[PDB]
Ligand binder design. Sequence first.
Ligand SMILES: *[C@@H]1O[C@H](CO)[C@@H](O[C@@H]2O[C@H](CO)[C@@H](O[C@@H]3O[C@H](CO[C@H]4O[C@H](CO)[C@@H](O)[C@H](O)[C@@H]4O)[C@@H](O)[C@H](O[C@H]4O[C@H](CO)[C@@H](O)[C@H](O)[C@@H]4O[C@H]4O[C@H](CO)[C@@H](O)[C@H](O)[C@@H]4O[C@H]4O[C@H](CO)[C@@H](O)[C@H](O)[C@@H]4O)[C@@H]3O)[C@H](O)[C@H]2NC(C)=O)[C@H](O)[C@H]1NC(C)=O
Ligand SMILES: *[C@@H]1O[C@H](CO)[C@@H](O[C@@H]2O[C@H](CO)[C@@H](O[C@@H]3O[C@H](CO[C@H]4O[C@H](CO)[C@@H](O)[C@H](O)[C@@H]4O)[C@@H](O)[C@H](O[C@H]4O[C@H](CO)[C@@H](O)[C@H](O)[C@@H]4O[C@H]4O[C@H](CO)[C@@H](O)[C@H](O)[C@@H]4O[C@H]4O[C@H](CO)[C@@H](O)[C@H](O)[C@@H]4O)[C@@H]3O)[C@H](O)[C@H]2NC(C)=O)[C@H](O)[C@H]1NC(C)=O
Ligand SMILES: *[C@@H]1O[C@H](CO)[C@@H](O[C@@H]2O[C@H](CO)[C@@H](O[C@@H]3O[C@H](CO[C@H]4O[C@H](CO)[C@@H](O)[C@H](O)[C@@H]4O)[C@@H](O)[C@H](O[C@H]4O[C@H](CO)[C@@H](O)[C@H](O)[C@@H]4O[C@H]4O[C@H](CO)[C@@H](O)[C@H](O)[C@@H]4O[C@H]4O[C@H](CO)[C@@H](O)[C@H](O)[C@@H]4O)[C@@H]3O)[C@H](O)[C@H]2NC(C)=O)[C@H](O)[C@H]1NC(C)=O
Ligand SMILES: *[C@@H]1O[C@H](CO)[C@@H](O[C@@H]2O[C@H](CO)[C@@H](O[C@@H]3O[C@H](CO[C@H]4O[C@H](CO)[C@@H](O)[C@H](O)[C@@H]4O)[C@@H](O)[C@H](O[C@H]4O[C@H](CO)[C@@H](O)[C@H](O)[C@@H]4O[C@H]4O[C@H](CO)[C@@H](O)[C@H](O)[C@@H]4O[C@H]4O[C@H](CO)[C@@H](O)[C@H](O)[C@@H]4O)[C@@H]3O)[C@H](O)[C@H]2NC(C)=O)[C@H](O)[C@H]1NC(C)=O
Ligand SMILES: *[C@@H]1O[C@H](CO)[C@@H](O[C@@H]2O[C@H](CO)[C@@H](O)[C@H](O)[C@H]2NC(C)=O)[C@H](O)[C@H]1NC(C)=O
Ligand SMILES: *[C@@H]1O[C@H](CO)[C@@H](O[C@@H]2O[C@H](CO)[C@@H](O)[C@H](O)[C@H]2NC(C)=O)[C@H](O)[C@H]1NC(C)=O
Ligand SMILES: CC(=O)N[C@H]1[C@H]([C@H](O)[C@H](O)CO)OC(C(=O)O)=C[C@@H]1NC(=N)N
Ligand SMILES: CC(=O)N[C@H]1[C@H]([C@H](O)[C@H](O)CO)OC(C(=O)O)=C[C@@H]1NC(=N)N
Ligand SMILES: CC(=O)N[C@H]1[C@H]([C@H](O)[C@H](O)CO)OC(C(=O)O)=C[C@@H]1NC(=N)N
Ligand SMILES: CC(=O)N[C@H]1[C@H]([C@H](O)[C@H](O)CO)OC(C(=O)O)=C[C@@H]1NC(=N)N
Ligand SMILES: [Ca+2]
Ligand SMILES: [Ca+2]
Ligand SMILES: [Ca+2]
Ligand SMILES: [Ca+2]
Ligand SMILES: [Ca+2]
Lengths: 388, 388, 388, 388
Amino acid sequence: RDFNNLTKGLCTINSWHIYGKDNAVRIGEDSDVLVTREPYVSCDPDECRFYALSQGTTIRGKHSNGTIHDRSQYRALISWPLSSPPTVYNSRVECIGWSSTSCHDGKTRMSICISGPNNNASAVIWYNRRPVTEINTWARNILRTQESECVCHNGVCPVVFTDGSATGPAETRIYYFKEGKILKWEPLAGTAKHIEECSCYGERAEITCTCKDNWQGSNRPVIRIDPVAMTHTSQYICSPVLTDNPRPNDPTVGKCNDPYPGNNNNGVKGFSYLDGVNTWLGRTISIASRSGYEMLKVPNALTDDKSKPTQGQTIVLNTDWSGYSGSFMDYWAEGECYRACFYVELIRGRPKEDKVWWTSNSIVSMCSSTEFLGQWDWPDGAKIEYFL
Amino acid sequence: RDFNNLTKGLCTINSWHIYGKDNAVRIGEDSDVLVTREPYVSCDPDECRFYALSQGTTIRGKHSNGTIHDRSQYRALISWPLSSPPTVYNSRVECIGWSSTSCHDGKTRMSICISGPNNNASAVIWYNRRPVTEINTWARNILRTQESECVCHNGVCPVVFTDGSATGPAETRIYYFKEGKILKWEPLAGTAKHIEECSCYGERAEITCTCKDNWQGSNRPVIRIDPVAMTHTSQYICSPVLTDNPRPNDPTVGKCNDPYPGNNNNGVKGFSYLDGVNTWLGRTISIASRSGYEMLKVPNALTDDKSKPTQGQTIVLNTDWSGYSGSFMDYWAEGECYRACFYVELIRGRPKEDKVWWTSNSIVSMCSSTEFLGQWDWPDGAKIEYFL
Amino acid sequence: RDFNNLTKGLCTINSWHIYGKDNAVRIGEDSDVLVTREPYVSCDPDECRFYALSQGTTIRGKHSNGTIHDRSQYRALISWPLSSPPTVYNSRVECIGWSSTSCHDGKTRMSICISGPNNNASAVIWYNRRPVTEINTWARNILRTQESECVCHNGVCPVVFTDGSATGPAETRIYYFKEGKILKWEPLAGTAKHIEECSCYGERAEITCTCKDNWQGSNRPVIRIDPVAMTHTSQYICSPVLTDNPRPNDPTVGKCNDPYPGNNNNGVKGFSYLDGVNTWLGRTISIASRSGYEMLKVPNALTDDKSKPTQGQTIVLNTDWSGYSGSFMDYWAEGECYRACFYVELIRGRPKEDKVWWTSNSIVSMCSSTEFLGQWDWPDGAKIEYFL
Amino acid sequence: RDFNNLTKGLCTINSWHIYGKDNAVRIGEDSDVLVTREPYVSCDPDECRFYALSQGTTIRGKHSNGTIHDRSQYRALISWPLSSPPTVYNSRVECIGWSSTSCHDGKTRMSICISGPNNNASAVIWYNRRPVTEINTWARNILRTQESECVCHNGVCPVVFTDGSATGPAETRIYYFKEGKILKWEPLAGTAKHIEECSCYGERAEITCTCKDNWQGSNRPVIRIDPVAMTHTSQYICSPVLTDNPRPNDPTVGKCNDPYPGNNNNGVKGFSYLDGVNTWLGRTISIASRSGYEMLKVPNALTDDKSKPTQGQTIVLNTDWSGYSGSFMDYWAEGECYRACFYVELIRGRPKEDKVWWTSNSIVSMCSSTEFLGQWDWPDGAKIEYFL
Ligand SMILES: *[C@@H]1O[C@H](CO)[C@@H](O[C@@H]2O[C@H](CO)[C@@H](O[C@@H]3O[C@H](CO[C@H]4O[C@H](CO)[C@@H](O)[C@H](O)[C@@H]4O)[C@@H](O)[C@H](O[C@H]4O[C@H](CO)[C@@H](O)[C@H](O)[C@@H]4O[C@H]4O[C@H](CO)[C@@H](O)[C@H](O)[C@@H]4O[C@H]4O[C@H](CO)[C@@H](O)[C@H](O)[C@@H]4O)[C@@H]3O)[C@H](O)[C@H]2NC(C)=O)[C@H](O)[C@H]1NC(C)=O
Ligand SMILES: *[C@@H]1O[C@H](CO)[C@@H](O[C@@H]2O[C@H](CO)[C@@H](O[C@@H]3O[C@H](CO[C@H]4O[C@H](CO)[C@@H](O)[C@H](O)[C@@H]4O)[C@@H](O)[C@H](O[C@H]4O[C@H](CO)[C@@H](O)[C@H](O)[C@@H]4O[C@H]4O[C@H](CO)[C@@H](O)[C@H](O)[C@@H]4O[C@H]4O[C@H](CO)[C@@H](O)[C@H](O)[C@@H]4O)[C@@H]3O)[C@H](O)[C@H]2NC(C)=O)[C@H](O)[C@H]1NC(C)=O
Ligand SMILES: *[C@@H]1O[C@H](CO)[C@@H](O[C@@H]2O[C@H](CO)[C@@H](O[C@@H]3O[C@H](CO[C@H]4O[C@H](CO)[C@@H](O)[C@H](O)[C@@H]4O)[C@@H](O)[C@H](O[C@H]4O[C@H](CO)[C@@H](O)[C@H](O)[C@@H]4O[C@H]4O[C@H](CO)[C@@H](O)[C@H](O)[C@@H]4O[C@H]4O[C@H](CO)[C@@H](O)[C@H](O)[C@@H]4O)[C@@H]3O)[C@H](O)[C@H]2NC(C)=O)[C@H](O)[C@H]1NC(C)=O
Ligand SMILES: *[C@@H]1O[C@H](CO)[C@@H](O[C@@H]2O[C@H](CO)[C@@H](O[C@@H]3O[C@H](CO[C@H]4O[C@H](CO)[C@@H](O)[C@H](O)[C@@H]4O)[C@@H](O)[C@H](O[C@H]4O[C@H](CO)[C@@H](O)[C@H](O)[C@@H]4O[C@H]4O[C@H](CO)[C@@H](O)[C@H](O)[C@@H]4O[C@H]4O[C@H](CO)[C@@H](O)[C@H](O)[C@@H]4O)[C@@H]3O)[C@H](O)[C@H]2NC(C)=O)[C@H](O)[C@H]1NC(C)=O
Ligand SMILES: *[C@@H]1O[C@H](CO)[C@@H](O[C@@H]2O[C@H](CO)[C@@H](O)[C@H](O)[C@H]2NC(C)=O)[C@H](O)[C@H]1NC(C)=O
Ligand SMILES: *[C@@H]1O[C@H](CO)[C@@H](O[C@@H]2O[C@H](CO)[C@@H](O)[C@H](O)[C@H]2NC(C)=O)[C@H](O)[C@H]1NC(C)=O
Ligand SMILES: CC(=O)N[C@H]1[C@H]([C@H](O)[C@H](O)CO)OC(C(=O)O)=C[C@@H]1NC(=N)N
Ligand SMILES: CC(=O)N[C@H]1[C@H]([C@H](O)[C@H](O)CO)OC(C(=O)O)=C[C@@H]1NC(=N)N
Ligand SMILES: CC(=O)N[C@H]1[C@H]([C@H](O)[C@H](O)CO)OC(C(=O)O)=C[C@@H]1NC(=N)N
Ligand SMILES: CC(=O)N[C@H]1[C@H]([C@H](O)[C@H](O)CO)OC(C(=O)O)=C[C@@H]1NC(=N)N
Ligand SMILES: [Ca+2]
Ligand SMILES: [Ca+2]
Ligand SMILES: [Ca+2]
Ligand SMILES: [Ca+2]
Ligand SMILES: [Ca+2]
């Protein structure tokens, strides 16, 4: 109808309720489920759907062998109905590639897929299910993007891309798209020293992105975008409650403008909701691997370098595999505020479970409640032994 | 369009005709059918669909092992086209959880799923396919609901929940929802001593629920709700024709305000249509197990403590497995009266058929006819031996 | 929109072109295709679909064993997209039963399914996907109907039913339905001595049905219905070109008002287009079994007792299995005339191919062309050996 | 709405970006994917879909044995969602046959399928999903058509057919259809000596078709059609950069009005975009087999007999199997110009990979970019060994 405008602020997050879960790996043990990774969730005005990068093969299919690899010509961004598994028969291909983002601007959806060899990748921006714009690699080193939904405001949908090294300074750009066309792009500015895989959400005409500093930071870089002025700033979450993985143990004081040291060249896509006292951080429980998942209320995490948790909720037990996580909200829901939501990728297979030759995942997602709900843990649920 | 109003009375029930049957277990022996239990049927203004709690695995899948269990993080309320089986590819997830209810108010549908550990469960109320309200457990002991459709009147859709013991007094509540929001809730009142799994239907601005007294009663508790005044009453079906299972043999006089004794801490979800002489009771044929199913016309069953059958119809032979049963009607059909309908869950597998490691079911459903139709029996139809 | 009216006459049939073919048995050798029999085709104003009686199991499924049987509680009328196979995932159940008919009146569709034991069957008439009317068996001996589409005119859709013996006189009735309700029913009248499985089509406000005399006739009975006056007549196709199966060799003179003798208590559903010189008869090539299929132009077959073929077209080679056949037309096509169409059921499995324990079929269908097209033969295409 | 008119010229082609890829053979190793060949892509005003000739069996199905054959009664034109594989469950049959074409005129789609024995084939023209016209073979020798989309202008959709020898002069006809009806047909005229499988596109009220001279030419014949005057001309691409396969090595001067010699009675469906300096030719890399695929910018190829490449892009490595290729464009996209697109059929199985008994393919497709994008190669991706 009309372009959506971020007119509401976040609802108060007092707990998290179950939103969606597809049990993909369980079901896929005996049905035609596509092998995936890098999933997310994204809403249209009339429906919310699960998204992910397919590996172009079923889990039980012999071609599942080798899917630990990140970029092949057989991957594609696919979407499928909320809480269903990604099957050969119900998956809709949005575009071809090995890194993506997607978002609805209120009128129609924009989807972006990047494909190519490491030194010659390119992104193609689709809008209303048609290719509209293409961007060639600018640093010739794995052009890559969010791996979760972008956010739009009055037709303007900003997207964060990175091209260059994963273990040294790279060239991060913020592109402002409108109807699939480029209105403007900026180089990254601010104090964030490295950016990859931004998880974004919007509220009151501002877009907040919690990304990852793969090079040096165990605290997360944050990019705040003004989609009207089409400008932004960057910093790190000041809080001592470190949220990347792997990471060192939590200190008593964090860092606001530099990566918190202790772990280099590694990390996991993650997210946060930074809203003063209504601030919640997500993170793996393990400091060593993609294991477990919890939500911690850390009032003023973004700006308070000594902020520590005041409440929390366990999403996945430390004895269960987690993975990537990101933000999304249903901007077309009823009510006076936007309800914060997120998903956690539950990785199964390689490298942690090497008795099988594949790597895939299932999805679990939650949204906020103003109630103080009881908690449950939500594991993938599959028995690897069955696949042997 | 406009909210539906219960303006019609029931059609005269002279017999029951076949409405839907999915042969899920038969078909699922060689196709991707999800393992389920606790099914029901529910209509929208333009379509009627089968509903059930999936176990997050196919019947032939190795994860089918263990599905006798009631509550896991892998269950979800799903719906699928009338008379089709619940397949991985045609099942639509309504919400995540292990106890549910759902109903269309004329404009859109409300679905409720409860999930959690036994001492920390919570219900999330979805409306127009979005989460709107959440209710935390109040007795910290398996918050649970209907397992069949709720009914709406002018936007108000009452739902019965129980939290607390299954073998002693519990805390039953009646919530009146409108657009997924809570308008009001009452504690159970009346003479019903325990309530679980209410089967409801509406006619002439009144909602009748036939539930189950798991603690002491072999006769069924009945809750009648006024959705305008948002008030209710409770009692038991007075009739000597006992309809719970297991149960003692039928006496010559029943009980109107206390559970009829003989069997404790057990029972099965069931239903009835209480409409003076146009009264029909459903029940398993066996007094010991979920075996067989019959419909008995027991004029004035609700209020006459010596009422006995005047007509009847066999739905499932005592040599076939039955299970849960419940009411639903198509409130958007043509004509001057609402046609009473019900479904019977045909349980296969554990605990009765333990040569297989799974528990699932198929569905059979009937609706009333003003004709006096010939009867047939409708078994699940699957041969367990094939699954060995 | 508005009820359809049979305002056009038939197009001139100079040959038959390929319309649809689903290759169900071939494809079903390695995919989830339902076992069926008694198929047909029927159009809605915006789509034409394949219809059939499912057996409630896949072909490869173990429950396929025994599907040679005609009536079980596991059968249902299903429809699926033109030329696709009837799969577990794309089949839409219209109603439950073992004998059916269905037709669109221009506004919505009426579907009829009969279920029951032999001595207590009943038909339930569905309209706009809801049950509206029920009719109890009147002769207590396998109430049965067309097994192909009915035809409507200004809301009135006549249907032919038979109840009673298959090898002696029975009670045949013509019901005139409008919006699923009974307007009137007549007993069969005319000279037809036995009626079963009528194949009907309409043109210029008249409905012609070519049925089968299972008891004594090798020539086919024909019922012509006036859907306005709601009256009918009956006779046999006068032609010496006999079209039932099994049957005696063709004589040089047929019979107009009595069954042509030579074969008792047996036959196959078949059809014809009786339109003066524009007359075409379908029949199996073999006089002994459901083998082969051909179309023969027999000018004035209905009224000329010495009429013999003037043109012809082979549909299925005598070295291939055929089966039932029937008429349908797309009454919502463009143009000035209705294009005659028909389908042939290609039966595979039992009783002719007993190395497998199942019985199923695929469908081939043709429509007329005013051109004189080259002919091809259209077999089922499956290799039984593969199923062993 | 209104008939589409070719009002735009081509966008400038500076490179090719990835459009769609279904990885059919990979996925089909463990899911219900139909065996196909002769694929293409075609757009409707609201969706673009993959098309192909099914073989009426799955790849893993036993009936896949023998699918190297071209024409059987089990083939049909099917379409399915962009980038999905052609599965039993998501494939929509457009018509029955072994040679086809299809195109949307802006209001609705016309699809054409030819079926029959070699000496008695016939084409049936479907419009708005109904059969409208039939054309009988005129040379009684494999009536055949494009195997890719046709193009329409103001309701007029020209189609090229060939009937007669594959190794000598044949009877090629250009039919001008409007709403499935024949407006006019011409015999081929111009200097093209043999025509088969035309790949067409339209721009500025002109339709260009790049076909194949199976008899003598290694350069490609080109037919330019005026769909208003309903007239055409024919010649060959003058360029020395030869684009058929098999073929001799490239000379330094080509031929404008006669087949370039060196290879007889063989070839592959191919295409080109002839637009002055904005000219791009597609071809297999190997001169001996359907191996590899590249796009070469050959300014003025059509008219310059010494034109050689000025830019290029590799689509498939010479160490990977290719096959047929053709043109299509989304005539309903936004913007001021039509974006040239094409697909390459990636053939797997027989005759080149004879360890398996089947022949099938997957599809890869690209569209033009005005950017100068980095290139990647796009192979089928399946491991034949897995199928053994
Ligand atoms: C039914 O459901 C309800 C609703 O969920 C249940 O109630 C919930 O119970 C939760 C578990 O107790 C609780 O979650 C905790 O909240 C704590 C905050 O609350 C407390 O402190 C505040 C502030 O003073 C008080 O106001 C309040 O009253 C409480 O006393 C958090 O601090 C908890 O998180 C910390 O502990 C968990 C382990 O339990 C860690 O996994 C987590 O990371 C936190 O601890 C690490 O991080 C901090 C910060 O740096 C460190 O200081 C600390 O040492 C830990 O650090 C190590 O571990 C991390 C992670 O591995 C590592 O990286 C680091 O290096 C170190 O090695 C926790 O979030 C909910 O708030 C509470 N909800 C409600 C509404 O009450 C109820 O129990 C259920 N009922 C039943 C019967 O089960
Ligand atoms: C073609 O189709 C038609 C249509 O369906 C067929 O006709 C139907 O036939 C049915 C079977 O006969 C019939 O159903 C019965 O109706 C009885 C009521 O009618 C009779 O009594 C009235 C009242 O006086 C008369 O007016 C009327 O004319 C009849 O004479 C019911 O009483 C029957 O139910 C009882 O029996 C069945 C076993 O048959 C039990 O399963 C059932 O539970 C009922 O009996 C138990 O319960 C009562 C009540 O407490 C006890 O008193 C009794 O002892 C039984 O109790 C034991 O069993 C229960 C259950 O296991 C247990 O819990 C308890 O402790 C005890 O152990 C039955 O419902 C249809 O009405 C009739 N329909 C029509 C329209 O006519 C026709 O036959 C078919 N044709 C052919 C050729 O087959
Ligand atoms: C390319 O395609 C075109 C288009 O299809 C091909 O041309 C077609 O060729 C067809 C085959 O020749 C032809 O079909 C036949 O038409 C005959 C009628 O035409 C002839 O007679 C008329 C009338 O005098 C002439 O005007 C006309 O010029 C012709 O001469 C039919 O009579 C044929 O059917 C009979 O034969 C077939 C066997 O071929 C039987 O299966 C069929 O049942 C008919 O014969 C039985 O029935 C009659 C009637 O009672 C008996 O008299 C006769 O003895 C047979 O009876 C036995 O068999 C039956 C069935 O098993 C059994 O029940 C009974 O008891 C007996 O045992 C046939 O229909 C098309 O008309 C013709 N089409 C056109 C447009 O030309 C062309 O060939 C193809 N090109 C190539 C290269 O292949
Ligand atoms: C990142 O991505 C970018 C973007 O893709 C990459 O840059 C591209 O690189 C491509 C490969 O170099 C390049 O493609 C070539 O373009 C040549 C034309 O450009 C050159 O000449 C012009 C004209 O003078 C100059 O202006 C320009 O500056 C260049 O110097 C083509 O000529 C190339 O095609 C020919 O070679 C390939 C093999 O490489 C053949 O397969 C192809 O068929 C062509 O050669 C055959 O045909 C010609 C014509 O008859 C014959 O003369 C020749 O001998 C060959 O003939 C044999 O082979 C054929 C086929 O098998 C056979 O039939 C015949 O009989 C003979 O046996 C080629 O197309 C892109 O243009 C370029 N793009 C851009 C924007 O720059 C960049 O490299 C990537 N980065 C990294 C790090 O990888
Ligand atoms: C069910 O009853 C309510 C009246 O209680 C109907 O609601 C009125 O509907 C009309 C048209 O929408 C409005 O102008 C009135 O204000 C509505 N509501 C109330 C609460 O007064 C409703 O239309 C009835 N539903 C149907 C299907 O007739
Ligand atoms: C079929 O015939 C009936 C007339 O018998 C048409 O019905 C009339 O339709 C118009 C418009 O709906 C009404 O105003 C008349 O009262 C209708 N009915 C009768 C029974 O008089 C009907 O429209 C015709 N169908 C079509 C498609 O033309
Ligand atoms: C473009 C790409 O391949 N990105 C990688 C990502 C990346 O390698 C690291 O962030 C370092 O740069 O790591 C991971 C990962 O799980 O750590 C998955 C991503 N997979 C995909 N998006 N396909
Ligand atoms: C919430 C829950 O687990 N409810 C149980 C129900 C319950 O245990 C008894 O009524 C006693 O309270 O029993 C049964 C049952 O088949 O008897 C199934 C239900 N299964 C599910 N709804 N998942
Ligand atoms: C109602 C019923 O079972 N009808 C039978 C039909 C019938 O038995 C004979 O016509 C004699 O009456 O025969 C056949 C048949 O193939 O000959 C199939 C039908 N199958 C089904 N419609 N299910
Ligand atoms: C009508 C028909 O069978 N056409 C053939 C085509 C043809 O044989 C040659 O062009 C020579 O005439 O060859 C090929 C081919 O791959 O070379 C495939 C086509 N397959 C199909 N369209 N089914
Ligand atoms: Ca890091
Ligand atoms: Ca009880
Ligand atoms: Ca007969
Ligand atoms: Ca399978
Ligand atoms: Ca050639």
